[PDB]
Write a protein that binds this ligand. Sequence first.
Ligand SMILES: COc1cc(C[C@H]2SC(=O)NC2=O)ccc1Oc1ccc(C#N)cc1C(F)(F)F
Length: 226
Amino acid sequence: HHLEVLFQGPVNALVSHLLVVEPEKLYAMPHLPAVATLCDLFDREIVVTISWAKSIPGFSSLSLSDQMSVLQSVWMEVLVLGVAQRSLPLQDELAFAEDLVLDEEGARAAGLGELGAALLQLVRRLQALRLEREEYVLLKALALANSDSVHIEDAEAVEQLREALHEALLEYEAGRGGAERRAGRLLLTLPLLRQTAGKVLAHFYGVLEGKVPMHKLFLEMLEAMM
Ligand SMILES: COc1cc(C[C@H]2SC(=O)NC2=O)ccc1Oc1ccc(C#N)cc1C(F)(F)F
């Protein structure tokens, strides 16, 4: 079941679907040290990210190989966008989970180096647009489909998924110099989104040593689930 029928109708059925498959709020707390708590939380975010992707209409239409290639290239973007998303109502704070909210200094003390600052930069870029939840899920799905993995074997198939999600965003906006410009403004945050994800990976790999090899960790979980 590839859920392709959701691309046929008015977009509101697709949006309703994205809203439903949005992961449940996680609780990071039960007493572990900050680093350990975040590590445990991270493992759960990885699994949730993978299950989320598989429920994105049209994703399953891609060859198994391309699904994995797409996921390996943007999983951090999806994850990071979730963090930014939970942080929007706050000021200069990061809601890693319902019950785990850190300011810049708290992030630094939790082993995140300067990621606190980098993540808040992303958060501020999104807060400036005052996202609604519908825009976030559409943008997130689009970020998944806008992967630029070097290992994609059917590039037009990925192109078509990306196009369909972009058109969904447009149709959603149109139905709330085209003022539906609203869509472009969301798209213009995608470069910072990708950069932020790269920054997170660089921090855990060290600079490129491999202290905390998240790509391997992700792959192992990916192939265990797919
Ligand atoms: C210090 O924070 C992390 C620790 C780990 C585990 C590592 S660190 C090491 O020394 N040993 C390992 O196993 C993994 C990832 C962490 O960062 C996050 C945790 C949770 C979320 C969410 N929601 C986002 C992040 C980020 F990656 F966006 F920073």
